[PDB]
């Protein structure tokens, strides 16, 4: 019943969070500057105490779907037009929301990015792009973004996905679903626990969703995982509280495993119907527990006039150390630079 | 006066991260611990542990900044915070057994250890160790002088990664010194890859070793039927050990997992047996010491270092060395299969 933990900020709590984000913007260049990220875990504890208490309850809730912090200050006039592409979305006016997303995120763990997503940016942008209407990436609009575990293919996938809504004039819903092990039966659960599935990287990790100047070798890891997926489970951990890892568009049973293929089909139908809506208004930030829920986004008509929906996105890990083989050096936060 | 610095050991330039508390920092930390002891039942009660990660951020800001640098330093051996307040008169005598060591007078030091530890991660304990207490006690016990346990004295505690056999082994081992009149040391060693043949290093990265559960996990006449399922898992890990690596992760910053008394090569892998004994001689030769005076707290990065303890002469007169001890995980969620419920912190309790 607390699977969605909703914190509505008081005026003072919103004001204090804004002032802390603005102090960070005054000190540091980028919301993912190395010097800022080294300090971020400590700066995050200058957020309001009552908010930190509720975030800490969310962090240790192993059945959390989403923490939702409502009512951060967003100055729509100062923010200016929604950029027409993520590459142009590192705007002066939006920096403060980047810094604030990292401060909230750093209460839950350490922020990471992907060498193969939005040019290795840690703070990324979710906005509609002309020509991506019908794609299965974050910049889509007309076609529903299919539910998925974020970076489901990767052993380094985030523990939390952070989404800070700057603008959402048409109240477009984020979609969310967890797995009730009781409502699929221990038969299917036992199959979903088996290493009997292939989970391929999604299209956001491909050269078609990154700058052309990026090195071909960044993508070798991704292409290997498309061509030759490892046999993996969808469920793991305790039977009473199993972790979920599946992507509606990029998951298959291994060849000739009709029982695995059947279990996958049951899961898709179970998650598809159970899929429920969370609307992030301007100033609302959600942390999805990526171990527990799949997420997507409802279809919407983008106006492409500078007024469109705009989220900042971040990946959070409970354990930065575990991915050191995949990072350039100790402090580097970009997965797949090694 | 507050100070902090990097103390090298061999070529490990940030081996030891030392923080010296100012008198005001020491007082702030003591007042926070005392306030926690007024508001919460125990240093490891559910009420306190649900809040511990937020309460830890009431510790002095300058100290939190230095602990945070330690937390993300993937070459750290030991974080040492020196100069916490200990009232020796009020503490009273060193108990004769851990079973008598969860004292009202020492609770405030349990609280403070959990507060420092919760800056680094989430505190955990072990079903088979001191009845699954999260805050444990390190003191010499009469009759254990010559054993390979924390309560030993006369015989060196031989060095190991803490709970080396276990995928749920801690990221940090924390120690809060209450008294140490004879300046008895914890022994510490990490691998310097530049002092070992690259071929030996390559072998240690292979899944070519068995790391068996140590004595603190093995069933005895008195280990109890309650942990029947744990001891079955332990028997499996003794009789049919998984093939595991000793080194893992990035070549530039490998994690170490080895136990000087419970590690062997896979049957017939003579090259692995050679690489293992080369590593044991290297770590044995690189061992150095951390001595914690009263109010000194250390966090050993269990991913990077083995640890043990020097031989010492216990008096068993109530004046002996006494530490509070804790285990810290960077990722509590990963061990849910081995814990009784979401908030429970005891590994092997279900
Ligand atoms: N649609 C789907 N089933 N999976 C891929 C979604 C890509 C999205 N996380 C992104 O843009 O990062």
Parallel, antiparallel, or unpaired: how do β-strands A285-289 and B12-20 relate? unpaired
Residue-wise DSSP of B231-264: HHHHHHHHHSPPPB-SEES-TTS-EE--BTTTEE
Q: Does the beta carbon of A288 sit less than 6 angstroms from any atom of ligand 1?
A: no
Bridge partner residues of B81 (DSSP): B19, B297
Q: Does the beta carbon of A145 sit less than 6 angstroms from any atom of ligand 1?
A: yes
Name the residue among A53, A319, A325 with its Cβ closest to that of B331. Answer: A319
Chain A nearest CA to B217, separation (Å):
21
Task: State both tokens at A60.
Answer: 């240790």
Task: State both tokens at A308.
Answer: 């469109």
Which mutation among A137, A147, A153 tests ligand 1's pocket best, with the greatest number of atoms within 8 A of CB? A137
What DSSP element (H or E) covers B37?
A: helix B23-39
User: A56 vs B61: CB contact, 8 Å cut-off?
Assistant: no
Q: Is B278 annotated as a binding residue?
A: no
Name the residue among B252, B253, B333 with its Cβ closest to that of A291. Answer: B333
Name the residue among A42, A159, A324 with its Cβ closest to that of B249. Answer: A324
Q: Which residues of A touch B54 (CB under 8 A)?
A: 45, 49, 52-53, 56
Cβ atoms of A111 and A102 within 8 Å: the answer is yes
Take atom 2 of ligand 1 and give the residue whose Cα is closest: A146
Question: CB A321: neighbour CB atoms within 10 A?
Answer: 21
Closest-approach residue (CA) in chain A for B335: A237
Closest-approach residue (CA) in chain A for B345: A60
- Give the total residue count for chain B: 350
**How far is residue A262's CA from residue A191's CA, in Å, rounded to a whole number?**
9
**How far is residue B242's CA from residue B236's CA, in Å, rounded to a whole number?**
9
How many helices and strands in chain B, by DSSP H and E? 8, 17
**How far is residue B127's CA from residue B225's CA, in Å, rounded to a whole number?**
12
Helix H, strand E, coil C: the string for chain A is: CCCEEEEECCHHHHHHHHHHHHHHHHHCCCCCCHHHHHHHHHHHHHCCHHHHHHHHHHHCCCCCCEEEEECCCCCHHHHCCCCCCHHHCCCCCCHHHHHHHHHHHCCCCEEEEECCCHHHCCCEEECCCCCCCCCCCCCCCCCCEEEECCCCCCCCCCCEEEEEEEECCCCCEEEEEECCHHHCHHHHHHHHCCCCEEECCCHHHCHHHCCCCCCHHHHHHHHHHHHCCCCECCEECCCCCCEECCECCCEEECCCCHHHHHHHHHHHHHHHHHCEEEECCCCCEEEEECCCEEEEECCCCCCCCCCCCEEEEEEEECCCHHHHHHCCCCCCCEECCC
Residue from A275, A264, A269 nearest A147 by CA? A275
How remote is the CA of residue A150 from the centroid of ligand 1, in Å?
7
Whether residue B331 lies within 8 A of chain A, CB to CB, comes out as: yes
**How far is residue B161's CA from residue B256's CA, in Å, rounded to a whole number?**
8
Per 3-state DSSP, what percentage of chain B is helix, strand, and coil (rounded to 5)? 30, 25, 45
**How far is residue A312's CA from residue A86's CA, in Å, rounded to a whole number?**
10
Q: Provide the 8-state DSSP code for B152.
A: -
Q: Does the beta carbon of A146 sit less than 6 angstroms from any atom of ligand 1?
A: yes
Cβ atoms of B32 and B115 within 8 Å: the answer is yes
Q: Is B186 annotated as a binding residue?
A: yes
Neighbouring residues of B229: CB distance < 8 A, sequence distance ≥ 6: B350
Q: Is A198 annotated as a binding residue?
A: no
User: A59 vs B53: CB contact, 8 Å cut-off?
Assistant: yes
**How far is residue A280's CA from residue A173's CA, in Å, rounded to a whole number?**
7
Resolution in A: 1.8
**How far is residue B187's CA from residue B193's CA, in Å, rounded to a whole number?**
20
Quote the longest CA-to-CA distance of chain A. Answer: 59
Distances (CA, A) of A5 to A64, A67, A70, A175, A184: 8, 5, 11, 16, 25
Residue whose token pair is 């709970």 = B163
Helix H, strand E, coil C: the string for B57-85 is: HHCCHHHHHHHHHHHCCCCCCEEEEECCC
User: B72 vs A42: CB contact, 8 Å cut-off?
Assistant: no
Parallel, antiparallel, or unpaired: how do β-strands B322-329 and B122-126 relate? antiparallel
The three-state secondary structure class of B10 is coil
Cβ atoms of B77 and B8 within 8 Å: the answer is no
Phi-psi region at B92: left, alpha or beta (left = phi > 0; alpha = psi -120 to 50): left
Task: State both tokens at A33.
Answer: 């500057």
Bridge partner residues of B17 (DSSP): B6, B79
Q: Does the beta carbon of A148 sit less than 6 angstroms from any atom of ligand 1?
A: yes
CA B54 to chain centre: 22
Q: Which residues of A touch B337 (CB under 8 A)?
A: 237-238
Whether residue A50 lies within 8 A of chain B, CB to CB, comes out as: no
Question: CB A239: neighbour CB atoms within 10 A?
Answer: 12
Task: Point out the ligand 1 atom lying closest to the alpha carbon of residue A117.
Answer: 12
Distances (CA, A) of A207 to A124, A132, A172: 16, 14, 28
**How far is residue B274's CA from residue B154's CA, in Å, rounded to a whole number?**
31
Which method resolved this structure? X-ray
Task: State both tokens at A253.
Answer: 């049973």
Closest-approach residue (CA) in chain B for A64: B342
How remote is the CA of residue A148 from the centroid of ligand 1, in Å?
7
**How far is residue B157's CA from residue B146's CA, in Å, rounded to a whole number?**
9
Whether residue B315 lies within 8 A of chain A, CB to CB, comes out as: no
**Sequence-ordered strand ranges (E) for B139-254:** 157-160, 172-179, 185-190, 209-211, 247-248
User: B61 vs A42: CB contact, 8 Å cut-off?
Assistant: yes
Take atom 5 of ligand 1 and give the residue whose Cα is closest: A202
Cβ atoms of B4 and B19 within 8 Å: the answer is yes
How remote is the CA of residue A250 from the centroid of ligand 1, in Å?
10
> Testing the interface with B: which of A41, A46, A242, A293 to mutate, by most B Cβ within 10 A?
A41
Q: Which residues of A touch B341 (CB under 8 A)?
A: 240
């Amino acid at each position: 019943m607390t699977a969605i933990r909703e914190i509505r900020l008081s005026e003072p709590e919103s004001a204090q969070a804004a002032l802390l984000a603005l102090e960070c913007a005054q000190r540091y260049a980028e919301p993912d500057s190395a010097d800022f990220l080294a300090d971020a875990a400590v700066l995050a504890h200058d957020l309001p105490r009552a908010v930190r208490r509720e975030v800490e309850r969310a962090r240790l809730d192993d059945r959390l779907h989403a923490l939702v912090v409502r009512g951060n200050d967003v100055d729509q006039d100062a923010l200016g037009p929604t950029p027409p592409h993520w590459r142009q979305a590192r705007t002066a006016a939006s920096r403060r929301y980047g810094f604030l997303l990292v401060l909230y995120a750093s209460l839950l763990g350490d922020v990471v990015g992907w060498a193969t997503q939005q040019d290795g940016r840690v703070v990324t942008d979710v906005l509609p792009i002309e020509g991506q209407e019908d794609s299965q990436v974050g910049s889509s609009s007309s076609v529903e973004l299919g539910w998925h575990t974020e970076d489901a293919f990767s052993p380094y996938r985030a523990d939390y996905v952070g989404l800070f809504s700057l603008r959402n004039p048409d109240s477009v819903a984020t979609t969310v679903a967890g797995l009730d092990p009781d409502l699929v039966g221990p038969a299917v659960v036992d199959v979903l626990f088996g290493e009997r599935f292939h989970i391929r990287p999604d299209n956001s990790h491909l050269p078609t969703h990154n700058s052309g100047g990026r090195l071909s070798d960044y993508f070798a890891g991704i292409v290997e995982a498309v061509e030759n997926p490892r046999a993996v489970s969808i469920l793991r951990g305790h039977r009473d509280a199993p972790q979920l890892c599946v992507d509606s568009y990029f998951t298959t049973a291994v060849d000739g495993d009709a029982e695995a293929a059947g279990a996958l089909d049951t899961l898709i139908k179970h998650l598809g119907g159970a899929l429920y809506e969370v609307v992030l208004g301007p100033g609302d930030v959600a942390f999805l527990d990526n171990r527990n829920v799949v997420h997507g986004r409802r279809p919407f008509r983008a106006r492409f006039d500078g007024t469109d929906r705009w989220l900042k996105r971040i990946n959070v890990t409970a354990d930065l150390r575990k991915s050191r083989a995949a990072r350039r050096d100790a402090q580097a936060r970009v997965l797949g630079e090694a």
